[PDB]
Input
Amino acid sequence: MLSYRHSFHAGNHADVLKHTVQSLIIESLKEKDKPFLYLDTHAGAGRYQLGGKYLEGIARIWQQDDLPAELEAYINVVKHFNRSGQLRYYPGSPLIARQLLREQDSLQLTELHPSDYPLLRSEFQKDSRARVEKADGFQQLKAKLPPVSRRGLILIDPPYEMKTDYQAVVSGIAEGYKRFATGTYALWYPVVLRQQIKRMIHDLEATGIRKILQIELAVLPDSGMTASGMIVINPPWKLEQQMNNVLPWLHSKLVPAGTGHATVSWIVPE
Ligand SMILES: Nc1ncnc2c1ncn2[C@@H]1O[C@H](CSCC[C@H](N)C(=O)O)[C@@H](O)[C@H]1O
Output
């Protein structure tokens, strides 16, 4: 295992949707002064040298003059790592959180790949808010929850290299939710095999967990990876409307020909 490297995919359309949603959840959590935890089970290397799927993702939005307000926090982090105006580095989920989180907040990050873990550690060598471990991310849903702050965003973002991930994300969410039922859980998934995503969502419904939102962006109709999504348990109350505001613009820029779709809907509605 562990042959996947996120550097091959960083900044693609999936990362754009994923990090849009991650950023909006973090900004909502920051509306209250009380600290919160950011927990990243499959954290990656931290930052990625781009120079090419990023050309069809982040490159198509980060310098647009009419950037929706819902993208400003995210795109400002991307600009922070590229102040020359040239697209050279892409900040992964840990660096988006590192820049958006406040002094009082905490980060718990895990990465198993033996070359990418040390790169991730280096990004946080002077940041006492963060802990970085070379450990199984699914175990952290038991070990690190609930946070003492009793507030948090948990991002579960595996590569689905091992087909066991389709079941492990549901089991892992169930274990995390048992320990921390008020947290916001954001699960990223690819659409390579639609029926396996339907199977996964069926298993998730069967847990009995309520308030489950689904955000999906497809660059092509169902048929490699044609789409990806974010399943969000306990979304901030504004998230659905924020996505209805921003998904049409996002899909039109990421997919100029109009193929595919961009939807927000409920798996388990209120
Ligand atoms: N069991 C496991 N525990 C922790 N990390 C794992 C894992 N299995 C695979 N990985 C790592 O999971 C990552 C998925 S890509 C993660 C990207 C990151 N969240 C971002 O948005 O920037 C890869 O870096 C891979 O090495």
Summary: The first helix runs from residue 13 to 29. The chain has one domain: 1-270.
